[PDB]
Design an enzyme around this catalytic site. Structure first.
Site, mmCIF file in Angstrom:
data_model
loop_
_atom_site.group_PDB
_atom_site.id
_atom_site.type_symbol
_atom_site.label_atom_id
_atom_site.label_comp_id
_atom_site.label_asym_id
_atom_site.label_seq_id
_atom_site.Cartn_x
_atom_site.Cartn_y
_atom_site.Cartn_z
ATOM 1 N N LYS A 64 -20.760 -54.762 -22.846
ATOM 2 C CA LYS A 64 -22.145 -55.019 -23.197
ATOM 3 C C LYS A 64 -22.891 -55.327 -21.890
ATOM 4 O O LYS A 64 -24.061 -54.981 -21.719
ATOM 5 C CB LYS A 64 -22.210 -56.217 -24.145
ATOM 6 C CG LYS A 64 -21.119 -56.216 -25.229
ATOM 7 C CD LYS A 64 -21.357 -57.356 -26.231
ATOM 8 C CE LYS A 64 -20.380 -57.352 -27.411
ATOM 9 N NZ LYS A 64 -20.723 -58.447 -28.371
ATOM 10 N N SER A 75 16.729 -34.072 -18.910
ATOM 11 C CA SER A 75 15.966 -34.358 -20.131
ATOM 12 C C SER A 75 16.028 -35.858 -20.273
ATOM 13 O O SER A 75 17.061 -36.404 -20.660
ATOM 14 C CB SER A 75 16.604 -33.724 -21.371
ATOM 15 O OG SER A 75 15.842 -34.027 -22.536
ATOM 16 N N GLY A 93 -15.759 -55.915 -33.769
ATOM 17 C CA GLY A 93 -15.276 -56.678 -34.898
ATOM 18 C C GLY A 93 -14.558 -57.918 -34.430
ATOM 19 O O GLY A 93 -14.323 -58.847 -35.218
ATOM 20 N N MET A 133 -15.081 -59.581 -30.745
ATOM 21 C CA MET A 133 -15.910 -60.455 -29.893
ATOM 22 C C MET A 133 -16.728 -61.515 -30.630
ATOM 23 O O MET A 133 -16.731 -61.560 -31.864
ATOM 24 C CB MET A 133 -16.871 -59.622 -29.051
ATOM 25 C CG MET A 133 -16.189 -58.570 -28.237
ATOM 26 S SD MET A 133 -14.912 -59.301 -27.233
ATOM 27 C CE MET A 133 -15.763 -59.557 -25.752
ATOM 28 N N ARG A 182 -23.027 -64.203 -26.375
ATOM 29 C CA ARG A 182 -22.124 -63.193 -26.917
ATOM 30 C C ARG A 182 -21.220 -62.614 -25.849
ATOM 31 O O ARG A 182 -21.704 -62.107 -24.833
ATOM 32 C CB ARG A 182 -22.928 -62.088 -27.621
ATOM 33 C CG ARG A 182 -24.292 -61.815 -26.995
ATOM 34 C CD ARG A 182 -25.060 -60.778 -27.798
ATOM 35 N NE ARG A 182 -25.443 -61.305 -29.102
ATOM 36 C CZ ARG A 182 -25.130 -60.754 -30.276
ATOM 37 N NH1 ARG A 182 -24.411 -59.627 -30.356
ATOM 38 N NH2 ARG A 182 -25.538 -61.353 -31.387
ATOM 39 N N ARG A 212 -23.869 -48.556 -27.092
ATOM 40 C CA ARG A 212 -22.448 -48.367 -26.804
ATOM 41 C C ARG A 212 -21.819 -47.138 -27.492
ATOM 42 O O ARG A 212 -22.073 -46.829 -28.655
ATOM 43 C CB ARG A 212 -21.686 -49.617 -27.183
ATOM 44 C CG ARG A 212 -21.747 -49.985 -28.635
ATOM 45 C CD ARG A 212 -20.989 -51.278 -28.790
ATOM 46 N NE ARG A 212 -20.702 -51.616 -30.171
ATOM 47 C CZ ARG A 212 -19.913 -52.620 -30.525
ATOM 48 N NH1 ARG A 212 -19.346 -53.372 -29.587
ATOM 49 N NH2 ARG A 212 -19.688 -52.867 -31.812
ATOM 50 N N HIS A 245 -17.409 -56.170 -40.943
ATOM 51 C CA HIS A 245 -16.115 -56.263 -40.251
ATOM 52 C C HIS A 245 -15.080 -55.210 -40.643
ATOM 53 O O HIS A 245 -14.693 -54.366 -39.817
ATOM 54 C CB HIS A 245 -15.527 -57.667 -40.461
ATOM 55 C CG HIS A 245 -14.480 -58.044 -39.461
ATOM 56 N ND1 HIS A 245 -13.127 -57.908 -39.706
ATOM 57 C CD2 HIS A 245 -14.586 -58.504 -38.187
ATOM 58 C CE1 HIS A 245 -12.448 -58.265 -38.629
ATOM 59 N NE2 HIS A 245 -13.311 -58.631 -37.692
ATOM 60 N N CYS A 259 12.113 -37.335 -23.921
ATOM 61 C CA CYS A 259 12.410 -37.317 -25.339
ATOM 62 C C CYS A 259 12.003 -38.554 -26.048
ATOM 63 O O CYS A 259 11.448 -39.479 -25.466
ATOM 64 C CB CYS A 259 13.907 -37.159 -25.568
ATOM 65 S SG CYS A 259 14.408 -35.504 -25.702
ATOM 66 N N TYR A 297 7.628 -30.439 -19.310
ATOM 67 C CA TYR A 297 7.102 -30.428 -20.651
ATOM 68 C C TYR A 297 7.333 -31.801 -21.248
ATOM 69 O O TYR A 297 8.002 -32.644 -20.634
ATOM 70 C CB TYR A 297 7.815 -29.352 -21.484
ATOM 71 C CG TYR A 297 9.311 -29.563 -21.644
ATOM 72 C CD1 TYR A 297 9.804 -30.588 -22.450
ATOM 73 C CD2 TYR A 297 10.236 -28.791 -20.931
ATOM 74 C CE1 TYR A 297 11.158 -30.850 -22.536
ATOM 75 C CE2 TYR A 297 11.606 -29.059 -21.016
ATOM 76 C CZ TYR A 297 12.055 -30.100 -21.824
ATOM 77 O OH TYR A 297 13.403 -30.425 -21.930
#
Lengths: 869, 869
Positions: B21, B759, B100, B102, B91, B336, B454, B826, B846
């Protein structure tokens, strides 16, 4: 002049001139690919022959018999000689690919003597005689003299009566003998005419077959269902034969550069070693995965793939090709944008785009609009498939979860309603004679064929389900039954799908690829036409909204009068003998109808909805069963006789053209008054409880005269205006009408004055224009298509030369007097790609069609835009 | 120095410095928007205070009390004066939005005397006292001194005991009196300490609350589940208060530029006239559609929308903002990037892209990877929903088809297993104290809240289902029951979804937007990492292949030994007292296992599959129930005692580290021999029946020494090589291993010599590295997160500072000796966005993860690419 063109004398350009295969073959030649030279008889020469009492003109023949000359000198052999015979293949090709329909002739030029010369020169007498026994069979079918069963019952009786299993195991004697067995059939199945031995008589015969077949029931019915005109015609191709049946190192196969049913990237096709695909591949003797041809002939594959990939980048689209291997040598005999299934259609389209091969306008323009209907066919329900009893498996020819009653013949499967009685067609294989049956069935189930087999081809083309090659199916026609898995069926209910499995199933509804969307976004970035939908209910609105429905174009209110908890209030109105009484009666409905539009407005979220006022005659709401009439005599303090007397008082000679719509609204304003309140009060209120602006559009039905619309509009504005006490309600709204009565279009300028918008009701406008009621047409309609009097169904495909003038006139004229005059179209025509284009080009603003055709409309509207810019 | 920064002294840049904020507020200021000036206490000052025994340092206070000075002179009023009091709001704001969670304080600066001065000067005594009664309640909760029920039971007892219905109807006296009723509670609910009257004591108190709360159970548990580190901290914001509760022309609302749960383009939010959102909007007194604020205050809307749209194009992303209207004037108090649901996430992402607002790298990088898991949560089954009994409707806070047992408290709903016992949480509203319950439930069902409430916020954030504002829910905690529709429930099974309806349901599985794909294509055009999956079965392979699984990374073979029709052959092997006998036994399994890989290879269609050899101890396959042991004494001609004697002979102290994997393979080659044949013979054969090339990858488990891998590889190559008689089978294949034992990584260069590929089995590698068995950790794990000793779960989130060294070392070292050494990962770590990035950056080739996380992996791999280029 010029009725025949050498492959080198043309290219893709003249596709119309040489037909489809024509330009492709010529194109492959111009590239410098390994293809057997040949020439092409023009589609025009098909016209000549037809516009000449169906006789092949003199100038034509000579020109055919001249290119044939060219070929001899071309490969040092004479056409069907006696010693070194030159054999050729014949195959038709229209400007519109008709995969599964066209015709093909192999080994033409052969005869009783030349085979023997082919035997010696070639040195393989089995071959010569095989290539001859085959060719006699084809000429017998193509140049239709006899059916295939006559011939296959013989070679088969011969094999299953000599301890043999495949024609690939018959000796040079078996065949030499077989040939006479066929030359015996063709004759004992005709006047007794000799079988053509003079190659010039065999080749000319071929051609007429082709030009002739272009008007036979099956073709006619096939084009119309594939939006192909009959003024085009076919072209015939003569190519210098090459053989994949010389033996162990020769072959022939069908293959696609990318899977034709999923878009999958990578080779998809089959083939058989030593055989002549033309018939052998599209049938028994289980073909082999084209990707195995690398194990067996790993040198031909190296080049077959190098060619296919350049054939695909050449045309910059996926290619459906045909090859034959001639003892080590590879021969291409065909290329063509593989026809696609919807999914594969978009999928490849996206790929070719990511792969840089093409631009988006391209892919957008490439998709066959109408096909997106497949995208929405209800898939099966997993749980229903999990509990499903799979009694057999086979090739997943064409996708989809089909299921319905089984029929062993297309004649009877269509008998049991089209895709309405949920039919299924179970056969050995299928053929051009089964077109309407495959077309009218949920799914096709065959006992032998493979990927290149008729049903698949023809099925993956009609976006219909097909399971082929399912051998374990023992079929009986005499008793119409078949054994599959652990059961025996009899015209009962069966189920199948692309999970290849056939079983003893609940279908649901489902998603759309991101590729549907990826192309939908594209359509949406090229379309100027907006796309609303025809929804009278929240759920349907929602459903269409989910497909890109930018609002509503036809929200019928009839039901609001129909529905049980509201029929008695409209009926009271009709029996009430006073306007004060009717008034009353009518007001009892405002609450309900009011509810109705509230729900639609909460649903529409700001999205425009053209509300159409009461359309049908009052007679349509009274009871026509004295059981109900006597019911309504107590809910009204009357007697049967008198209620009946009223009913019979409302009965019209022609309901489609009487005291209904706008005319009821004049005689009984009250009605129109009540609809204006329910709609106004409803709009204001949601606009009140959501703040999202609404701008109602009231639409007057069946208007045919300016003063006629004014009178009623004058009634709406006053009620609309009055209702404005829930606040003067700064709320805007537009009175408009339906241009569905010829006079409306002829006097548009005049109509535009009172009306703030035109909404073309083409279905009716088409009945007043053609003069025939959709409801009583079919009894003659078919004879019109058969007689070729009609190429298309006006009720599904907007008559453009006629109904099109009325439509273009209302817009023109309508805008002379109201330059802004928004315009739309309704009913079916709004969801038809062809129509959607016309409208775009003529002047409409948006298009409206059922909720599930929104995608078809959008793509079409899209394409129409790119095409006419 | 510099512990506090003026909004004008910063911008988006220093988000870390000023918190979320923080920079936004400062950014809005720098733009020149209508926002109440203020200043910000740095996150750093949170550190100071924390790394100072939790005391607010001197240099800090002064600097706070100096900016407060600045503000007075800024709007001519002194902080909480006696006559013209300057009130402010407090705040907190961390560098990571925690919607929900802060805290916020309104009207701070008020007290017994200044209210009265606020009463006179302002001229609206109801207001002053309302703004005071509110503020006392908040300070009581935020700066936690007491619960909300204490206060709401009072104003409510007051209203429901004075014929009133909304606090909006209490007189200046009601409130003036109420205030004492609260100042009475705060004290009778504490030592007896007076309530802060000295604004300087109220404001300093606030701040400590914030800095303090940043370490309380709830925060700790929230960050870990939101991958937020605890070394960051919060920043506290002090802003000059503005009021939407001055009366009939002042307000306050929450709104989003585009629907946060569907991507929908266009304003989405609520508001209330005369009220202070902070509490009033996020609660009862049904809020109004932000799009109605146009009816009521149609001048403020004109500008609220003009601002929101420039706030959205400014940050070039969708904005979650907060406004209050001060009698005609509009005030922005927040902007935001709205947190999103998966669907809305991609959807907006696509839009912002088509709308030209952003580039694709942007959108790809923007999606919160982990969230794509939502995309795959099983939707309901239509037929099941059609027959579904809807006993009530309410707001569709967060999407999804949730359903499970109901629990009226988060403490007990989590008690009944996480998202495993299919739990549902029914409450009035929810709060930061319910975090793990909302998190562990299928769906959240509330009785009052709205969009800004909330549960929605916190639910649409965790991609979990929520139905709020359902008033008709009468809840009882003392008996734990609730009445909904025509029924009364008691911890039984209930069902809900985004179709907003709650009911008395079968879920299935389902599609993925074209927007999932549209972004998946993008991911795929930016990712260098390839993505395989962990599948041991055809269906799962297929399922993952459908998500972009480029092959397999972990195909467990255990089951092939387990499964009923194959357990007795492995058991015979263990009891067989001869290698010739074992050999035998083992061979009986080759057919089955062979079948197994055939199916996987037919399925994989050319796609690589790393096959992992027998991993568990032989003890894992013998019977451990003498009922079964005596069963196996007859299927083997033995006695219980002796079979039991064997069983007890295989029993190990630590199964995770004994004679298993590679070590069984050394002692019992036979086993490894048999696996090589089943795999080789299977690959060859499909390669034989499809021609599509296969290249098997055998993977040796639990290797910890080069010579150890060699020995076993020497056994595979010989069997593999032998099997090559179905032809010398030119078929290639690679022996490789699993780097899952520290020595493997430490001696990679040495291991690379025998192994053709690494692997990483990070799950185990993480147990040998951390030294603790996943299976017995949880009993202490939690205390580690609670004690903040652990910020993340290593078993789901790859320990990078530790396990990460072993991984980066194996790759380095492994490639010194084998430059090509392909590498993979893995288990879970392969499917974790954070991990996936590390691997990308460290060197893997990968990534492999379960089938449904392939999308999460791909996007992650994608992002990792863009982020580290």
């Amino acid at each position: 002049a010029k009725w025949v063109y050498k492959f080198e004398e043309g290219n893709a350009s003249m596709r119309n001139l040489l037909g489809g295969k024509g330009c492709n073959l010529a194109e492959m030649t111009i590239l410098g690919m390994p293809i057997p030279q040949g020439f092409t008889v023009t589609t025009e020469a098909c016209t000549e022959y037809y516009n000449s009492g169906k006789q092949i003109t003199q100038e034509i023949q000579d020109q055919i018999f001249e290119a044939i000359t060219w070929l001899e000198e071309l490969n040092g052999k004479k056409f069907g000689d006696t010693e070194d015979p030159l054999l050729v293949s014949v195959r038709s090709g229209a400007r519109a690919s008709m995969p599964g329909m066209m015709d093909t002739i192999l080994n033409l030029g052969l005869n009783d003597v030349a085979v023997e010369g082919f035997a010696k020169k070639t040195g393989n007498p089995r071959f010569a005689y095989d290539s001859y026994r085959r060719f006699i069979q084809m000429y017998s079918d193509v140049v239709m003299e006899v059916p295939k069963s006559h011939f296959e019952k013989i070679i088969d009786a011969m094999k299953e009566e000599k301890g043999v299993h495949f024609d690939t195991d018959l000796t040079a004697d078996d065949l030499k003998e077989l040939a006479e067995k066929f030359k015996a059939v063709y004759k004992e199945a005709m006047n007794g005419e000799e079988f053509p031995q003079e190659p010039k008589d065999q080749l000319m015969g071929a051609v007429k077959a082709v030009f002739r077949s272009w008007d036979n029931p099956r073709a006619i019915v096939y084009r119309r269902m594939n939006d192909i005109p009959g003024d085009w015609g076919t072209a015939v191709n003569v190519q210098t034969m090459v053989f994949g049946n010389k033996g162990e190192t020769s072959g022939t196969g069908v293959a696609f550069t990318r899977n034709p049913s999923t878009g999958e990237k990578g080779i998809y096709g089959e083939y058989l070693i030593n055989a002549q695909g033309e018939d052998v591949v599209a049938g028994v003797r289980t073909p082999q995965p084209i990707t195995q041809l690398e194990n067996d002939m790993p040198d031909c594959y190296k080049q077959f793939m190098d060619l296919a990939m350049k054939l695909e980048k050449h045309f910059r689209d996926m290619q459906d090709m045909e090859f034959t291997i001639e003892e080590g040598k590879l021969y291409f005999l065909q290329t063509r944008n593989g026809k696609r299934t919807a999914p594969a259609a978009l999928q490849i389209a996206c790929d070719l785009v990511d792969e840089g091969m093409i631009t988006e306008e391209e892919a957008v323009v490439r998709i066959e609009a109408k096909s997106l209907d497949q995208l929405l066919h209800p898939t099966f329900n997993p749980a229903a498939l999990k509990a499903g009893e799979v009694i057999g498996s086979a090739l997943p020819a064409s996708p989809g979860a089909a299921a319905g009653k089984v029929y062993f013949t297309a004649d009877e499967a269509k008998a049991a309603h089209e895709k309405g009685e949920r039919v299924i067609l179970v056969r050995l294989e299928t053929s051009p004679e089964d077109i309407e049956g495959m077309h009218a069935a949920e799914g096709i189930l065959t006992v032998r064929g493979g990927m290149a087999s008729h049903a698949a081809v023809v099925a993956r083309g009609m976006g219909t389900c097909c399971v082929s090659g399912c051998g374990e199916i023992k079929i009986n026609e005499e008793a119409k039954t078949f054994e599959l898995g652990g059961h025996t069926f009899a015209e009962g209910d069966y189920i199948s799908l692309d999970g290849s499995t056939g079983k003893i199933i609940e279908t649901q509804e489902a998603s759309v690829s991101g590729s549907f969307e990826r192309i939908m976004v594209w359509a949406d970035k090229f379309r100027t036409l907006k796309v609303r939908t025809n929804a009278d209910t929240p759920e349907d609105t929602l459903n269409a909204v989910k497909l890109g429905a930018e609002g509503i174009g036809l929200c019928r209110t009839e039901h609001m009068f129909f529905e049980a908890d509201r029929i008695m209030k409209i009926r009271k109105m009709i029996l009430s003998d006073s306007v004060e009484a009717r008034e009353e009666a009518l007001n009892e409905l405002i609450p309900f109808q009011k509810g109705d539009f509230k729900a639609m407005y909460k649903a529409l979220e700001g999205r425009p909805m053209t509300v159409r006022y009461l359309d049908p005659p009052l007679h349509e709401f009274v009871p026509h069963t004295e059981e109900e009439q006597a019911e309504l005599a107590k809910n009204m303090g009357l007697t049967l006789a008198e209620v009946k007397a009223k009913v019979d008082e409302l009965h019209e000679f022609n309901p489609m053209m009487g005291h209904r719509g706008c005319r009821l609204a004049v005689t009984y304003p009250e009605i129109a008054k009540m609809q204006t309140r329910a709609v106004m009060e409803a709009a204001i209120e949601v606009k009140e409880e959501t703040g999202i602006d609404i701008v109602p559009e009231i639409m007057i039905p069946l208007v045919g005269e300016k003063k006629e619309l004014k009178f009623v509009k004058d009634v709406v504005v006053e009620v609309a205006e009055q209702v404005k006490k829930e606040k003067g309600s700064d709320m805007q709204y537009h009175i408009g009408t339906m241009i569905e009565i010829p006079r409306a279009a002829l006097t548009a300028d005049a109509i535009a004055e009172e009306a703030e918008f035109f909404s073309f009701g083409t279905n009716d406008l088409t009945q007043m224009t053609f003069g025939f009621s959709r409801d009583d047409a079919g009894k003659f309609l078919d004879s019109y298509y058969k007689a070729k009097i009609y190429e298309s169904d006006p009720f599904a495909r907007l008559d453009q030369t006629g109904v099109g003038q009325l439509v273009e006139m209302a817009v023109k004229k309508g805008r002379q007097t109201r330059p802004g005059l928004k315009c739309g179209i309704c009913g079916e025509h709004g969801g038809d790609p062809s129509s959607v284009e016309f409208c775009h080009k003529v002047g409409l603003n948006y298009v409206s069609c059922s909720p599930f055709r929104v995608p078809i409309a959008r793509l079409a509207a899209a394409q129409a835009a790119l095409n006419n810019k």
